[PDB]
A and B are shown apart, each in its own frame.
Chain A
Amino acid sequence: SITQLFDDLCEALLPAANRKRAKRSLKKVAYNALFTNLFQLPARNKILMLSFDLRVGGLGPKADRLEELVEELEAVGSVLDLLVQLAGSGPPRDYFLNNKHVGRNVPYSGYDCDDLSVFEMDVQSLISREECLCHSMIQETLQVMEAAPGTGLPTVGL
């Protein structure tokens, strides 16, 4: 039932708030935006253009892993065209990052410390994440120590 799979799609995006008259109006927006676009192997190539954007910021074998799976998916093409539409939904450790202290094969490579400088940012991202978690903890309590009554309180409406 295709006409219901659009009704199920507007249910996931509708969170708590009604939610039974909103469901009818969002069923309309699903169809009403389908014909706005109509009025006014290059399938795997769309992945490789994002695989390029992976490899420039490091993380090489991860992009090599992305291409093994599109290799078995083309050994389904209508699914990937929706997946490439967004590449970010984010905010508005490994020993195999560098193998230099263990392993089997090791020709002596001296030092670079450019590997260590992208190993210090592997550290500095953790210090910036576990600090912003605590910055949304002191924000949640300074927004209650300070305010005036009537900002977002339902009991003052009574």
Chain B
Amino acid sequence: DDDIAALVVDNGSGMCKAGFAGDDAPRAVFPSIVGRPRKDSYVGDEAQSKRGILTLKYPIEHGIVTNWDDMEKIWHHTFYNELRVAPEEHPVLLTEAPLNPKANREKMTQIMFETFNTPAMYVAIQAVLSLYASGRTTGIVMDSGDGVTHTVPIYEGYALPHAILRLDLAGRDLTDYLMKILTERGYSFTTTAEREIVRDIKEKLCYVALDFEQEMATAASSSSLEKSYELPDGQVITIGNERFRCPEALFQPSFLGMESCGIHETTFNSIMKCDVDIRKDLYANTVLSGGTTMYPGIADRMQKEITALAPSTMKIKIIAPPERKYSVWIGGSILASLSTFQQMWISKQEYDESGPSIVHRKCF
């Protein structure tokens, strides 16, 4: 910062990203794993190698904290090992999921201020910080991470909680449907590495569809959507028909088997339950988000569904960057670096006079 330097930590679902404020890249990124004896409570390479006497556990599951001790372990091991700095000279920005209950947030600020002892702190929604990187202060964000997903409306520094739509579909459901469609075709799954290599195959080689009707119509007449993969393990699998239908599960939800809503009806229901006066002002610039951009092509779908959603009395002014995956990170990094943003930061004095619970009030 300028007075007392800020620090930014984004604990994602597939990885932990930590770093200093005013840094474009994160200073350290390691995978999301927390050890336990079946060496102990490690984040990084040793825990992944020693999964024969280590228990694989993830700290954040859906946007909710499955084990609180797990979250404290990854937070403690992130601040002490992949940063190595004294907390007394560095306040930290913490992250959370949109529409998180107040008791969870009170416990989170309480546990960071007492069992870890920060000077000052902040707890942030991820999607609003992602919007702050695209320069605007208003917009509807369609956020689909690797396990965390919401369509969040926000307009002028405030989000309507009634219209923040929590979404089942995520990278969790992505790999679930990956393994399901592969065993449905006929493919053996027996361990963690087969799940990892199938996720890598969807990340690198897989076409991200635009309709189900159109690409299947071109593939039924002549399959020109086949992409060859010749593996060195000794396996020859190649099917172009499966790979365009595999990310189709967001278009119509019954492709996965999921009860929950589809993506177009979700963004429709969110803009309908957000204010009428803010609607066109929201559409004056719509924003892209989501870690699901690892194959680019979902961006075209995001612009396409937002063209069809909002009424076109204007050419769509949607901001579509390839900063979409790390948008949360760079948002936290750019906001926390500034000195005026220390007025939105919560101090120790405020924690003592009004309790921790004011974190639900001051930030949302």
Contact = CB atoms under 8 A, between A and B. Distances in A.
Interface of A: 1-4, 6, 24, 27-28, 30-32, 34-35, 38-39
B24 A34 contact: no
Contact of A39 (B22, B132, B135, B156): B156
10 shortest A-B CB distances, which residue pairs?
A: A34-B135, A3-B321, A35-B137, A3-B323, A31-B135, A2-B321, A38-B137, A2-B319, A1-B322, A28-B334
Q: Most chain-A Cβ atoms within 10 A of its Cβ — which of B135, B319, B320, B337?
A: B135
A38 B322 contact: no
A138 B181 CA distance: 82
A44 to B, nearest CB: 17
Interface string B123-140: 000000000111111100
28 contacts: A1-B321, A1-B322, A2-B134, A2-B321, A3-B133, A3-B134, A3-B322, A3-B323, A4-B321, A6-B135, A24-B22, A24-B24, A28-B334, A30-B135, A31-B132, A31-B134, A31-B135, A31-B334, A32-B334, A34-B135, A34-B136, A35-B132, A35-B135, A35-B136, A38-B137, A38-B138, A39-B137, A39-B156
A30 B138 CA distance: 17
Contacts of A39: 137, 156
Given A3-B323, A24-B24, 12 more contacts: A1-B321, A2-B319, A2-B320, A2-B321, A3-B134, A6-B135, A28-B338, A30-B135, A31-B132, A31-B135, A35-B132, A38-B137
A21 B308 CA distance: 41
B168 to A, nearest CB: 29
Nearest to B284: A38
A5 to B, nearest CB: 9
Contacts of B135: 6, 30-31, 34-35
A80 to B, nearest CB: 15
Nearest to A6: B135
Nearest to A31: B135
Contacts of A35: 132, 135-137
Interface residues of B, number: 18
Interface of B: 22, 24, 132-138, 156, 319-323, 334, 337-338
A38 B22 contact: no
Contact of A32 (B138, B156, B321, B338): B338
A25 to B, nearest CB: 8
A133 B83 CA distance: 59
Q: Most chain-B Cβ atoms within 10 A of its Cβ — which of A24, A34, A35?
A: A35
A28 B137 contact: no
Contacts of A28: 334, 337-338
Contacts of A30: 135
Contacts of A1: 321-322
A71 B350 CA distance: 61
Nearest to B323: A3
Contacts of B24: 24, 27
Contacts of B334: 28, 31-32
A2 B321 CA distance: 5
A31 B138 contact: no
A24 B21 CA distance: 12
A39 B135 CA distance: 12
B133 A31 contact: yes
B129 to A, nearest CB: 12
Contacts of B337: 28
Contacts of A31: 132-135, 334
Nearest to B133: A31
Contacts of B133: 3, 31
A27 B319 CA distance: 16
A39 B334 CA distance: 18
Contacts of A27: 24
A38 B134 CA distance: 13
Contacts of B137: 35, 38-39
B343 to A, nearest CB: 14
A72 B261 CA distance: 48
Contacts of B132: 31, 35
Nearest to A35: B137
Contacts of B319: 2
